[PDB]
Amino acid sequence: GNVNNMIGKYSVKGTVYDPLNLASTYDNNWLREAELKHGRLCMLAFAGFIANDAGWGLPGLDIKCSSVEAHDKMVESGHMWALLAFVSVCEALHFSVIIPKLDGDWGDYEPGNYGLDPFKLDTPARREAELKNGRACMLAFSGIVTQAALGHPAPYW
């Protein structure tokens, strides 16, 4: 694809933000798919960091730990292995669907259109909101992890 025809340009000024001209280096559809996946994974990570530090808990875990050290405790316990199995199944399906179309025709598969729209909530404004929230979440989660890892409590400051 071509980045100039995609959704997600600068909102108020309307210009494409590619100062380093990296759009031409790689397949633009792959860039869109990776951007959406990174943004979505980071929204989930941001919400999970905040929820774990809040202490919501999960049906069935007794372990109560801070999110900065929850990784080691949960991989020792074994929950992270089940989560990795689930993610591996889903991302192996995504492997099978996208990697056969890396540097070739992508067909009818729009980047990020998995078809999980049972409630019929699709809108171009909502796609733009998805991209902007994903970018904000990428930056916010970067900040939240590097602030918590330095020992700053839950508000993160």
Partner: protein, 210 residues
């Protein structure tokens, strides 16, 4: 009466015309590397050089005799070594971190010495691995004598049929993925043999950690 300078010693009506027919060239194989042709002036693009690398001309040694293998066989062996070396280098890298399977009273998978890692296991545990490799390498190999003499018809070099459907339909992208395979395989071959050489004689690989 063929590409070879000499008629094959195999007789007429029992193989001679089968060996002495036209064979595909090295240029029609996805192995060119831009890194070798990475200098001012002449050079390639998309990770591939305009021409393949063969200083010793082992690819076209068939013209002297049919004792020597064909480029189809050489590509089959290259991809086999690359795949095996990729699995091997990944295995040693993962094992050296200390990560190991749970184990029980009978089996203990706790050993960081990759050289002596198989020796610690019981006879059955590595026996199953060797038996699986023996059966598969031997069942998947049908028509390899045909790739030696050159008949890339029944068997394509490196196409075992495992996950071949995930290759892209576009020729350019399929060749790109095949070239990525070849490059990673060659890098893994160099890496695993370098680690082995470093183990046998220290200092062979100065950047070693194993």
């Amino acid at each position: 009466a063929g590409p070879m300078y000499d008629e094959p010693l195999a007789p007429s009506g029992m193989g001679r015309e089968f060996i002495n027919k036209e064979r595909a060239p090295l240029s029609s194989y996805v192995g060119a590397s831009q890194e070798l042709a990475a200098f001012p002036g002449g050079g390639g693009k998309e990770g591939m050089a305009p021409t393949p690398w063969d200083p010793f001309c082992f690819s076209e040694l068939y013209k002297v005799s049919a004792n020597n293998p064909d480029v189809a066989w050489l590509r089959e062996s290259e991809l086999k070594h690359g795949r095996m070396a990729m699995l091997a280098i990944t295995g040693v890298m993962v094992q050296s971190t200390g990560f190991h399977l749970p184990g029980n009273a009978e089996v203990s998978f706790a050993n960081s010495d990759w050289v002596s890692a198989p020796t610690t296991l019981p006879p059955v545990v590595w026996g199953q691995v060797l038996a699986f490799v023996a059966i598969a390498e031997g069942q998947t190999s049908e028509g390899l004598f045909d790739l030696w003499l050159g008949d890339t018809s029944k068997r394509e070099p490196g196409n075992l049929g495992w996950g071949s459907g995930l290759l892209s339909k576009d020729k350019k992208a399929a060749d790109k993925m095949r070239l990525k395979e070849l490059k990673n395989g060659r890098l893994a071959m160099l890496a695993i043999m370098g680690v082995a050489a470093n183990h046998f004689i220290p200092g062979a690989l100065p950047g070693c950690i194993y």
